Design an enzyme around this catalytic site. Structure first.
Site, PDB file in Angstrom:
ATOM      1  N   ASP A   1       7.442   5.247 -11.704  1.00 22.24           N
ATOM      2  CA  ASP A   1       8.040   3.940 -11.847  1.00 22.24           C
ATOM      3  C   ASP A   1       8.525   3.160 -10.629  1.00 22.24           C
ATOM      4  OD1 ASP A   1       8.268   3.966 -14.540  1.00 22.24           O
ATOM      5  OD2 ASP A   1      10.457   4.712 -14.495  1.00 22.24           O
TER       6      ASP A   1
ATOM      7  N   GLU B   1       0.552   3.627 -13.794  1.00 28.54           N
ATOM      8  CA  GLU B   1      -0.393   4.665 -14.474  1.00 28.54           C
ATOM      9  C   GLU B   1      -0.846   4.871 -13.184  1.00 28.54           C
ATOM     10  OE1 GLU B   1       0.171   6.064 -16.984  1.00 28.54           O
ATOM     11  OE2 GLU B   1       1.259   4.446 -18.206  1.00 28.54           O
TER      12      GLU B   1
HETATM   13 ZN   LIG Z   1       4.246   7.885 -16.769  1.00 24.12          ZN
END
Ligand SMILES: [Zn+2]
Ligand code: NA
Length: 630
Positions: free
Chosen positions: A539, A476
């Site tokens: 990621d 995030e």
């Molecule tokens: Zn995302």
């Protein structure tokens, strides 16, 4: 079952993957869907106890809406009747001028229109709300599909046509009118598609930055009376509005003329029915999801409970999610996740500091984004003020209740245009099994729903939590500097804070990240590495910073726990048909690749499981890709 050195995802999830049927009422079964089901079960039980009295008024309303949605008996008894007067009304609008002349009622009574309003922050002034002007979606799951006439497009149109004709039959259309209306509607849909961005383009934020003056809106849409109707709900008309996509609104006066009005009219009628059908009998709500089920390969509709809970969540998700968090999310879990987020942000600062490619000016503004970043943890202390304006009455049927909420919602938002963005609005409800980053607010949100097994536990080791939840926290934060996020400043405004050379270096990483995923297989379907670049960046940099919290010289058993827990948190089994649709639209890569691809970039992966060059999970050093941590 493969060795963990050859396939991390299958070594961890392969036993579950092979044995777990996908239920006929689902298109996917996963860690998150199973947790979602568990949450739903608990909350339905709780809301079932709250009609007569509840802790607050918004929670009473939530319980009331759920009770209406859950009343299978009433909804069966009413059938299609609740929609009939709405359909009669649209059917008396036989010309464009009658449509225009009815526009105040159409806007007031929440009808399907060729433009719909949404209010959120201005991308060039994130402190204030702007009116966004959205329009219809295409029947095909990507507007780019219309470029190529083929059998899949024909099959998809036939599936939709079959649904639409049956919905018109339900309200008494003849075979002849069914056919005529469905064909007429497809004709609008085909012309619409020329002015809808391809899905790949919808993955980039700049696609949505389409400001225009109020006069230009009048020039584009005043012939339908739409801007005038909208303006009656505002104290003043704003100076500037924003078209959601570039090309639709400008072309609306070609798309909808007196000569081709009948095609719009057919589409509008079918879509009004389909939309309202969700709130009618079980048969009709099922009918209205037939096409989406065809696209998913899903044999059956969702359960009744899942459907009824979904409806209550359309308007009361924050209220429900606030209750969930207050009730089921402990203070000690909250403190431990709060500490984890503070630690990840601190480590992200260290990584920017140690970074060796960013020039001083760029590095400082990156740090600024971490400096102003706000955290929404578990559930809101205070409900968003929209909830002072939504209500549900005891005797209303479901369609009446839904139409009112829609009206109350539209009226509220039209009043927010003269006003500063309320930072107290959350983009997710506390029970959601998900998490987010908002560039306009520069904040990160972690609903209580995701802060439990299989993602987090007070009883798990730090390494397990880092793998299950840490990489998510990092993900995030990483969205502030992905290919979209990097375009906004620490205040939520679009502004170029990069030097040319640093922007060039960044662009090359983004390009390498698209290449790292492009064309990989999932369930027989090709992944689009450009489409999914933003999420694959998040990621990668998210896993990186989470791994750094294990310290400089981690025990192998903790390195192993981190990757195993991460891998298990992503267990996902979906229908091949659903993959085909998803992989054309979703910015996320599929779960198998979100597991197996990123790990191979990091020395800790090789150390964890003593991975060798002959192993399936080995990437050649010169292909390894890291972002800030280099
Ligand atoms: Zn995302
Ligand atoms: Na997800």
């Amino acid at each position: 079952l493969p060795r963990i050195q050859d396939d991390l995802y299958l070594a961890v999830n392969g036993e579950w993957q092979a044995k777990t049927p996908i239920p006929p009422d689902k298109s996917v079964v996963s860690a998150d869907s199973n947790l979602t089901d568990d949450i739903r079960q608990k909350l339905v039980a709780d809301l079932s106890t709250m009609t007569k009295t509840a802790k607050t008024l918004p929670l009473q309303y939530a319980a009331r809406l759920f009770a209406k949605a859950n009343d299978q008996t009433r909804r069966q008894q009413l059938g299609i009747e609740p929609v009939r007067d709405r359909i009669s009304f649209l059917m008396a609008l036989t010309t464009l001028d009658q449509f225009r002349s009815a526009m105040p009622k159409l806007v007031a009574d929440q009808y399907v229109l060729p433009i719909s309003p949404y209010v959120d922050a201005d991308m060039h002034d994130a402190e204030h709300n702007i009116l966004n002007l959205g329009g219809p979606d295409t029947i095909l799951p990507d507007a780019a599909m219309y470029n190529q006439e083929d059998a899949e497009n024909a099959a998809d149109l036939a599936a939709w046509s079959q649904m639409a004709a049956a919905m018109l039959a339900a309200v008494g259309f003849s075979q002849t009118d069914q056919t005529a209306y469905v064909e007429a509607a497809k004709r609008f849909d085909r012309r619409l598609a020329d002015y809808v961005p391809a899905n790949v383009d919808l993955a980039v934020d700049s696609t949505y930055d389409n400001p225009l003056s109020w006069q230009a809106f009048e020039d584009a849409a005043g012939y339908l009376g739409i801007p005038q109707a909208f303006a009656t709900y505002m104290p003043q008309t704003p100076a500037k509005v924003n078209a959601v996509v570039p090309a639709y609104l400008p072309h609306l006066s070609k798309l909808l003329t007196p000569d081709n009005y009948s095609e719009w009219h057919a589409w509008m009628v079918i879509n009004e029915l389909l939309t309202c059908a969700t709130y009618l009998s079980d048969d009709l709500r099922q009918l209205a999801g037939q096409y989406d089920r065809f696209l998913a390969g899903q044999p059956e509709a969702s359960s009744w409970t899942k459907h009824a809970f979904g409806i209550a969540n359309e308007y009361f998700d924050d209220v429900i999610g606030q209750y969930y968090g207050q009730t089921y999310f402990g203070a000690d879990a909250k403190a431990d996740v709060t500490a984890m987020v503070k630690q990840i942000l601190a480590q992200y600062r260290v990584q920017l500091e140690n970074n060796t490619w960013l020039s001083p000016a760029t590095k400082q503004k990156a740090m600024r984004k971490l400096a102003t970043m706000q955290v929404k943890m578990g559930y809101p202390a205070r409900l968003f003020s929209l909830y002072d304006h939504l209500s549900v009455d005891v005797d209303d049927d479901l369609l009446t209740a839904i139409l009112k909420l829609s009206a109350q919602t539209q009226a509220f938002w039209f009043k927010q245009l003269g006003q500063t963005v309320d930072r107290n609005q959350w983009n997710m409800p506390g029970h959601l099994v998900n998490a987010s980053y908002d560039p306009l607010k520069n904040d990160i949100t972690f609903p209580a729903g995701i802060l439990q097994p299989p993602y987090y536990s007070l009883k798990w080791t730090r390494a397990e939590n880092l793998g299950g939840t840490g990489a998510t926290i990092g993900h995030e934060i990483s969205h502030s500097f992905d290919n979209n996020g990097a375009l906004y400043d620490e205040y939520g405004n679009l502004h170029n804070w990069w030097t040319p050379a640093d922007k060039q270096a960044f662009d090359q990483l983004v390009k390498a990240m698209a290449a790292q995923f492009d064309g990989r297989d999932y369930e027989g379907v090709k992944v689009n590495g450009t489409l999914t670049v933003s999420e694959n960046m998040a990621d990668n940099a998210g896993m990186d910073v989470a791994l750094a919290l294990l310290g400089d010289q981690p025990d192998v058993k903790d390195l192993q726990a981190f990757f195993i827990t991460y891998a298990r948190s992503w267990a996902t089994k979906m229908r091949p048909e659903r993959a085909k649709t998803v992989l054309r639209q979703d910015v996320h890569a599929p779960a198998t690749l979100r597991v197996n691809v990123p790990v191979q970039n990091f020395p800790a992966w090789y150390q964890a499981f003593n991975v060798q060059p002959q192993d399936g999970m080995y990437r050649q050093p010169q292909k390894r890709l890291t972002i800030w941590h280099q």
